[PDB]
Short mmCIF file of C-alpha atoms and ligand atoms in Angstrom, two decimals:
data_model
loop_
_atom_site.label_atom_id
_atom_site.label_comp_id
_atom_site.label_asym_id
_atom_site.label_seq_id
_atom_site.Cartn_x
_atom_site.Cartn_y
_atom_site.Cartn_z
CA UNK A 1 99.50 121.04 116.06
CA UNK A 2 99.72 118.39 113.51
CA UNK A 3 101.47 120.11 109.86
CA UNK A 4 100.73 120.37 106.70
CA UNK A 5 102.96 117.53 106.36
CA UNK A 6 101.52 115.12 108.46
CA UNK A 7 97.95 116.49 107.86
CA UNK A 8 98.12 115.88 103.56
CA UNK A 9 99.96 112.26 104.74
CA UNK A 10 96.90 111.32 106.09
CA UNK A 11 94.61 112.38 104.02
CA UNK A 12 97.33 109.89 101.52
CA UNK A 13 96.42 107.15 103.99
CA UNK A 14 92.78 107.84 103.89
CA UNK A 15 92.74 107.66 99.95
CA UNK A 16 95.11 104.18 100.58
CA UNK A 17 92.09 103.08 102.98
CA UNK A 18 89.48 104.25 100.90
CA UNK A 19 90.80 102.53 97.76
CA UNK A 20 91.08 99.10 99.64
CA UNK A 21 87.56 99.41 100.41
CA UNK A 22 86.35 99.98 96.72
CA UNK A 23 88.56 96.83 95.67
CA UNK A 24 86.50 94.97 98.69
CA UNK A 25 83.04 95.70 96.75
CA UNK A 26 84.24 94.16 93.97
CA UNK A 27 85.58 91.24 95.60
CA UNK A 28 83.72 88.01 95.41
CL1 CL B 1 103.86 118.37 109.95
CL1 CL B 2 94.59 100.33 104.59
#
């Protein structure tokens, strides 16, 4: 089964994702 490791990385590339998204709203 996936880690700790690997499990907290993604949740690091989740916040990455998420974060692009709230720049998007903003975006004009
Ligand atoms: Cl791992
Ligand atoms: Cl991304």
């Amino acid at each position: 089964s996936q880690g700790t490791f690997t499990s907290d990385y993604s949740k690091y590339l989740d916040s990455r994702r998420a974060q692009d998204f709230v720049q998007w709203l903003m975006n004009t």
